[PDB]
Amino acid sequence: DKQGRTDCPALPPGWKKEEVIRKSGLSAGKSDVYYFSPSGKKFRSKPQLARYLGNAVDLSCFDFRTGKMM
DNA sequence: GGAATCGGCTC
DNA sequence: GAGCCGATTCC
Ligand SMILES: [Mn+2]
Ligand SMILES: [Mn+2]
Residues A7 and A5: their CA atoms lie apart, in Å, by 7
Residues A36 and A16: their CA atoms lie apart, in Å, by 5
- 3-state DSSP of chain A: CCCCEEECCCCCCCCEEEEEECCCCCCCCCEEEEEECCCCCEEECHHHHHHHHCCCCCCCCEECCCCEEC
The count of other CB atoms within 10 Å of the CB of residue A54 is 7
Protein residue at shortest CA distance from C1' of C2: A30
Give the range of the structural domain holding residue A38, as residue numbers without chain letter.
1-70
Residues A15 and A36: their CA atoms lie apart, in Å, by 6
Q: Is the CB of A22 under 7 A from strand B?
A: yes
Measured CA A42 to C1' B8 distance, in angstroms: 23
- How far apart are the CA of A7 and the centre of ligand 1, in A? 46
As for how many domains chain A has, the answer is: 1
- What CATH number does the domain containing A59 carry? 3.30.890.10
Contact A36, A43 (CB under 8 A): yes
Report residue A20: phi and psi, to 5°. Answer: -110, 130
Residues A46 and A2: their CA atoms lie apart, in Å, by 24
Report residue A49: phi and psi, to 5°. Answer: -65, -45
